[PDB]
């Protein structure tokens, strides 16, 4: 967290005025090309692509969506829980407009999506292909409280002929970092069900390990909440091995606390072009989240 | 009824030039309130719109 000044322009040409706002470390980078820092930083979305706002009045929270069919074509939905991503199904339903969907941006997990009752399901395009993704459908959900307790401020300052920037002003009081919290016991039960379903060909061999590293859009669990792009970390999960005795690890019921990060910019669908900006949310930032899914990748660099 | 000079851009970005035209008082308003000594003005719609 840094408080940062720079110049801006009025609607006129020559009129320029200084102004200050707040920025994180994710948005900018230090110019180490010089002798030292010397308070010298630069936006990365700037020096890779162009820049624009994201219509701050248009907040980026989801809506129940339903996809409808044209004339002469229809939708067919299988009504079997354990029916995996392919194959033959009998319990059919013909439809004109899809069930209510919440198509939310989420990495490594699902959010507020449809559930898979009855049993837990695990699929992949080619499970024998280690590089393929392992899509998951849980039986139940979990209350996920990812939240920043610090209120946001806004400075709606005109720049152009009606063009205004919503700068993240100074925050009130002692400014702690964000965080996120999750239940332990229901989480361990869902883990028990998952590891009970993991035995595709084995009796006891299962391990989880965190990602080796890479793009932060893929290296953690990101999503959108009240407009802000939250990245709530995934580290309380990989430290889990229900290999030999499942009930052995049903005991450590612990309120799972973790640091959840945030973000303002995005290049959706990994298209490296003109990025966008996210405004403040003014007021403390809660985020409820259910859970209905998960995604993994197998370890090809191992036995 | 007044007439005003002001800068504008030349087709060369490094070059600008002062040009002058005529305007009324309805489309502008006084600013920098040294209340009456050759006060400068600003358009009514530019400070809020394009």
């Amino acid at each position: 967290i840094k408080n940062c000044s720079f110049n801006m322009t009025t609607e006129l040409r020559d009129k320029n005025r200084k102004v200050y706002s707040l920025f994180y470390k994710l948005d900018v980078v230090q110019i180490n090309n010089g002798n030292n820092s010397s308070n010298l930083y630069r936006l990365i979305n700037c020096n890779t692509s162009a820049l624009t706002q994201a219509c701050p009045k248009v907040t980026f929270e989801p809506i129940p969506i339903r996809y409808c069919a044209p004339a002469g074509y229809a939708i067919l939905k299988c009504n079997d829980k354990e029916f995996n991503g392919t194959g033959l199904c009998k319990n059919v339903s013909t439809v004109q407009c899809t069930h209510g969907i919440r198509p939310v941006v989420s990495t490594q997990l699902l959010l507020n999506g449809s559930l898979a009752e009855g049993k837990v399901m695990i699929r992949s395009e080619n499970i024998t292909n280690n590089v393929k993704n392992i899509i998951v459908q849980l039986n139940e959900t979990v209350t996920i409280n990812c939240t920043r307790p610090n209120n946001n401020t806004r400075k709606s300052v005109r720049i152009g002929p009606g063009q205004t920037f919503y700068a993240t002003g100074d925050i009130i009081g002692d400014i702690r970092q964000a965080h996120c919290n999750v239940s332990g016991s229901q989480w361990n039960r869902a883990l028990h069900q998952v590891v009970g379903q993991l035995r595709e060909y084995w009796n006891t061999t299962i391990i989880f390990k965190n990602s080796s590293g890479g793009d932060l859009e893929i290296t953690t669990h990101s999503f959108n909440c009240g407009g802000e792009f939250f990245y709530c970390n995934t580290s309380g999960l990989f430290n889990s091995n229900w290999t030999h005795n499942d009930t052995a690890s049903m005991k450590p019921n612990d309120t799972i606390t973790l640091p959840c990060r945030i973000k303002q910019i995005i290049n959706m669908w990994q298209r490296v072009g003109q990025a966008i900006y996210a405004p403040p949310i003014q007021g403390v930032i809660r985020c409820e989240s259910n859970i209905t899914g998960l995604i993994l990748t197998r370890d090809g660099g191992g036995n | 009824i007044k007439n005003c000079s002001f800068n504008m851009t030349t087709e060369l970005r490094d070059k600008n030039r002062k040009v002058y035209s005529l305007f009324y008082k309805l489309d502008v308003v006084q600013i920098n309130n040294g209340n009456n000594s050759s006060n400068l003005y600003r358009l009514i719609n530019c400070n809020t719109s394009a």
Partner: antibody, heavy 137, light 111 residues
């Protein structure tokens, strides 16, 4: 015109205090800094003190530093100087001067301070009317 | 503390160009390039003569050209006028954000 006026000066006594006030008109005093300077008879100038606009900073000459205290009044659009332990060395005429406008020109582009503020560390485009002050025991 | 030293009095005939020269130190003149020159006549308030030394101040004639070398400053003038008689004081901004003036230079018209 940014026409300024002095007040409070005159024949006075040593040891007490002296409220030297400086008003003005013809402009907006909300965001303008001000210098106090003095010059004695048969002697040139000597910088007394300086103050910014928004009460943030203020600077004193090490000679007069501590013996005097500068202050401002934004609503009144006024500058004030409170003396302490008045001395005959303060016998001089005192001038209340302005700053070199607000913006800075680069590539014929005028940059400004924060909150559209007038700022410089530069010459004084205007000078007050002046006030005599005669400290004598 | 040491004011920017210059002779307390100078003289010259009208029209004949002259050059005022004042001294400084490393603290103010060697510390920055914001060397100014003011003028004040008997019965007149002070007014500037130079700021931003190699460019001239508001509304003054095109004859008064400032220059600076190391810790010293100077101002060359052509077409010596009569109304310009009076004291001249160069000033420089110290490194501590404080300023300091000079001793003075009274211009007297010969003839």
């Amino acid at each position: 015109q940014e026409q300024l006026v002095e007040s409070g000066g005159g024949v006075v006594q040593p040891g007490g205090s002296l409220r030297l006030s400086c008003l003005a008109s013809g402009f907006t005093f909300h965001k303008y800094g001000m210098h106090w300077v003095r010059q004695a008879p048969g002697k040139g100038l000597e910088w007394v003190a300086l103050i910014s606009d928004d009460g943030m900073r203020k600077y004193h000459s090490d000679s007069m530093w501590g013996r005097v205290t500068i202050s401002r009044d934004n609503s009144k659009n006024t500058l004030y100087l409170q003396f302490s332990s008045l001395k005959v060395e303060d016998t001089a005429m005192f001038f209340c001067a302005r700053e070199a406008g607000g913006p800075i020109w680069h590539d014929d582009v005028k940059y400004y301070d924060f909150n559209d503020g007038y700022y410089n560390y530069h010459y004084m485009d205007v000078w007050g009317k002046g006030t005599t002050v005669t400290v004598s025991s | 503390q040491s004011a920017l030293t210059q002779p307390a009095s100078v003289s010259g005939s009208p029209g004949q160009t002259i050059t005022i020269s004042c001294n400084g130190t490393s603290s103010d003149v060697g510390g920055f390039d914001s060397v100014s020159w003011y003028q004040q006549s008997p019965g007149k308030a002070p007014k500037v003569m130079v700021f931003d030394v190699s460019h001239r101040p508001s509304g003054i004639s095109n004859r008064f050209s400032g220059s600076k070398s190391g810790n010293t400053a100077s101002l060359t003038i052509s077409g010596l006028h009569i109304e310009d008689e009076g004291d001249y004081f160069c000033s420089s901004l110290t490194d501590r954000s404080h300023r300091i003036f000079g001793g003075g230079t009274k211009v007297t018209v010969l003839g």
